[PDB]
Design a protein around this nucleic acid. Structure first.
Ligand code: MG
Ligand code: MG
Ligand code: MG
Ligand code: MG
Ligand code: MG
Ligand code: MG
Ligand code: MG
Ligand code: MG
Ligand code: MG
Ligand code: MG
Ligand code: MG
Lengths: 134, 260, 226
RNA sequence: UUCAUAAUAACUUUUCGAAUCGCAUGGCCUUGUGCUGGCGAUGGUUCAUUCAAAUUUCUGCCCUAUCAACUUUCGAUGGUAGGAUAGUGGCCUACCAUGGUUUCAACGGGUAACGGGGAAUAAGGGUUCGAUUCCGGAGAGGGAGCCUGAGAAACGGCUACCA
RNA sequence: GAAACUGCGAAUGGCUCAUUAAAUCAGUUAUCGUUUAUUUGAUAGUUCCUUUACUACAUGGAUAUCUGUGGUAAUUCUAGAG
């Protein structure tokens, strides 16, 4: 067998953050990496949480496969996970949508343009409309 | 120049933080508070780099903002609020009450304390003065300023503060042959008894202090915080109990206590 | 030139273009903050009385009241003044300005029509535009009607009724400053605090006096021996 | 200590002592819609506290004698008194005195000189190098001048003038 | 919940090494010689004015974003009006 064996080193329970954090030690044999999803699934039945409340990061294999060292948090509630997790991780998991935002540069430009006018732009537009006769 | 410094590069950072040389251009500068920048300990450092209750700044902020962390009765929502020496850090969830009291090496220790003891802050006295409406008041080196102290409380004396209200329960006078804790410089984190105080005109009062191990050390009076009578300190002291060992002894302890 | 004429009571604005130099010559050498007649200015304006306040020079440098001179003058201005909206909390700037007296170099004269005449101009005097807002303060509301303390607010508030397309809904002003329960409660609490703290202080003082007395006596018991 | 403070006399274009917000909203009836009350935000007077800030003691810099006197009219040194300043002080002004620094290098002149922490160099002593990851300090084209503000003589703030 | 007023913040950071040779600077002093937003603490029954025919306190006064009118070739220029 490939074993796929999971291990949870250093279990720190946070009543502050309502989650159990730990260093996942994972045994590969004859398999390159492990994929986060699978790990989450495995944890979800080990700790009773459901893939959503489990959050695993970190890994990177040691050498010649064999071992991988991650960081798993397991949240007491899924709602809690949603409201304590940084959003990128949630997006990765699939829980939350990627925030549909424009380029940084564009945003900055927009801000600068806004700065160059006082208050609302409706008035300015109206003025421009009258300046067509000029 | 040009106005108060806001930042603190992660180096110029005080070494007793036990911060990392890497992971960030900056350290957290503690805000103003009850303690001196160089000899405080901001909460971002505490709830992360010691207890490992958090894992990054955002997490720490989140923890703070739920308003469960409490420093000395009051809540605190500030990330960098200076929790210095003698600060009682109570967390309602966990029930893990701490009192920030130094290790023998210098660095602040995770001193985990009972909900009965973690109630009173012992506090050194900086000043005895007379304010407005002719009222005498005491200043604690450890931040606070108490209205109306007992006439037999003087300077450089330690004081049991209620913390439940913020008055004086009891006090220890500065006397030779009274248990004392060191809060400054090289001898920082040692405990002992005091043998002599040199009266010294102007240039700092010095204390020759024997510990329990009959090994003298001498420090400045500003660096020394009284802790109780011989046998009875009012505070529970850390593992090591402020005696401090020579390097060899420490090494021996390390390589003898191998229990897998 | 262009005359920026306005009725304040009716609350209406217009710009009237004038090319005839004889009509312009009424305004020459006049300072801003003066009273102008109707009849010489125009045949349309007869019996009318202007007050002159503000204008705009050609090249676009605004008329500031109290510069004097019929010229363009560079000026150092800050907060509280006209012709300058500052971009920093307390910062001066040396702009340019056009003097309060009127010559040929102007493009616009801002004129306020103070007294009526004979011929009503299109819609500036005929048609009215109402107030955008109603009073926000309770006192202000009272002023608007004349009700006295007993009458209360709520009753006379200008509610706006807005339509999205099918759904019709209401928007109402938050009448700041009121005889509301919460305010009263807050006031009471404040009063209580003021009393209570003082009482506590008094008690403390008494206690300390007692303590002192209980030290003085002790002192006297040791002193009388030798 | 003339300190901290308290006391009497007055003082002031009488500083400040809340005409602030949010969510909760219960006990007792003289049954009024009554008397009230909790947690928290903001504020605000001084007093500490801290972040600082100025100043400030002592001691320590690279060459140069082809730099031996320098400094004082227009502050040099000190005095008294003022003015100013957040506060001390030639910080400036009035008046009086004639000091002060120097071969144990003053003052000049240089620097291809920002100063430390440090860097290279591998006996011991050392040499050089430090614009540069930290700490200070200047400076924002050059000189000025100021406004706001706790804090700038700010330069992604003005105000000239010169380039 | 745009805008804008009010508060804060913009004096930190970041860049550079031109000045500058007891200046900076380092260590050590001191501030009984000072200001200090902020943080933390603490901190105002007495504000009245002859004190029985009395004072809104179940709370008192006017101004600025947007609506319309412009100008100027323009630019974080803004006049008048409500
Ligand atoms: Mg309100
Ligand atoms: Mg003097
Ligand atoms: Mg050098
Ligand atoms: Mg350097
Ligand atoms: Mg260079
Ligand atoms: Mg340049
Ligand atoms: Mg800048
Ligand atoms: Mg400048
Ligand atoms: Mg603003
Ligand atoms: Mg800087
Ligand atoms: Mg240079």
């Amino acid at each position: 067998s490939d074993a796929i064996t999971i291990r949870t080193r250093k279990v720190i329970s946070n009543p502050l953050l309502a989650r159990k954090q730990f260093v996942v030690d994972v045994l590969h044999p004859n398999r390159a990496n492990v994929s986060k999803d699978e790990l989450r699934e495995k944890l979800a039945e080990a700790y009773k949480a459901e893939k959503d409340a489990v959050s695993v990061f970190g890994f990177r294999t040691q050498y010649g496969g064999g071992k991988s060292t991650g960081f798993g948090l397991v949240y007491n509630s899924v709602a809690d996970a949603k409201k304590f997790e940084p959003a990128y991780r949630l997006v990765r998991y699939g829980l939350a949508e990627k925030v549909e935002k424009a380029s940084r540069q564009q945003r900055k430009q927009r801000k600068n343009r806004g700065k160059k006018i006082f208050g609302t732009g409706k008035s300015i537009a109206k003025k421009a409309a009258r300046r067509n006769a000029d | 120049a040009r106005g108060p410094k806001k930042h603190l590069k992660r180096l110029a950072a005080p070494h007793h933080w036990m911060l990392d040389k890497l992971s960030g251009c900056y350290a957290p500068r503690p805000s103003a508070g009850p303690h001196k920048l160089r000899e405080s300990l901001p909460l971002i450092v505490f709830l992360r780099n010691r207890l490992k209750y958090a894992l990054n700044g955002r997490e720490v902020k989140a923890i703070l903002m739920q308003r469960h962390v409490k420093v000395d009765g009051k809540v605190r929502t500030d990330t960098t609020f200076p929790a210095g020496f003698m600060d009682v850090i109570t967390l309602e969830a966990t029930n893990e009450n701490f009192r920030l009291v130094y290790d023998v090496k210098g660095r602040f220790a995770v001193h985990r304390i009972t909900d009965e003891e973690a109630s009173y802050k012992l506090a050194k006295v900086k000043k005895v003065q007379l304010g407005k409406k002719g009222i005498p008041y005491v200043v604690t080196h450890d931040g606070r300023t108490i209205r109306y102290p007992d006439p037999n409380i003087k300077v450089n004396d330690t004081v049991k503060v209620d913390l439940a209200t913020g008055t004086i329960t009891d006090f220890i006078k500065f006397d030779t042959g009274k248990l004392v804790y060191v809060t400054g410089g090289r001898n920082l984190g040692r405990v002992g008894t005091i043998v002599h105080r040199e009266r010294h005109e102007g240039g700092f009062d010095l204390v020759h202090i024997k510990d329990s191990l009959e090994n003298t050390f001498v420090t400045r009076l500003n660096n020394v915080f009284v802790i109780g009578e011989p046998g009875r300190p009012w505070i529970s002291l850390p593992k090591g109990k402020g005696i401090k060992l020579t390097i060899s002894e420490e090494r021996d302890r390390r390589r003898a206590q191998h229990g897998l | 030139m262009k005359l920026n004429i306005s009725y304040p009571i009716n609350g209406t604005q217009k710009c009237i273009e004038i090319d005839d130099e004889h009509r312009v010559r009424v305004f020459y050498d006049k300072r801003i903050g003066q009273e102008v007649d109707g009849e010489s200015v125009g045949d349309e304006f007869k019996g009318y009385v202007f007050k002159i306040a503000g204008g705009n020079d050609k090249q676009g440098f605004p008329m500031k009241q109290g510069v004097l001179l019929p010229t363009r003058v560079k000026l150092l201005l800050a907060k509280g003044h006209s012709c300058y909206r500052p971009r920093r909390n307390g910062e001066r700037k040396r702009k340019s300005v056009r003097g309060a007296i009127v010559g040929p170099d102007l493009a616009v004269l801002a004129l306020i029509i103070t007294k009526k005449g004979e011929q009503e101009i299109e819609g500036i005097t005929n048609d009215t535009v109402p107030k955008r807002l109603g009073p926000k303060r309770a006192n202000n509301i009272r002023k608007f009607f004349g009700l006295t303390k007993e009458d209360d607010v709520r009753d006379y508030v200008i509610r706006r009724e807005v339509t999205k397309g099918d759904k019709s809904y209401t928007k109402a002003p938050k009448i700041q400053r009121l005889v509301t329960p919460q305010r009263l409660q807050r006031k009471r609490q404040q009063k209580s605090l003021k009393i209570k703290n003082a009482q506590a202080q008094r008690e403390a003082a008494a206690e300390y006096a007692q303590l002192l007395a209980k030290r003085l006596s002790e002192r006297k018991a040791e002193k009388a021996e030798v």
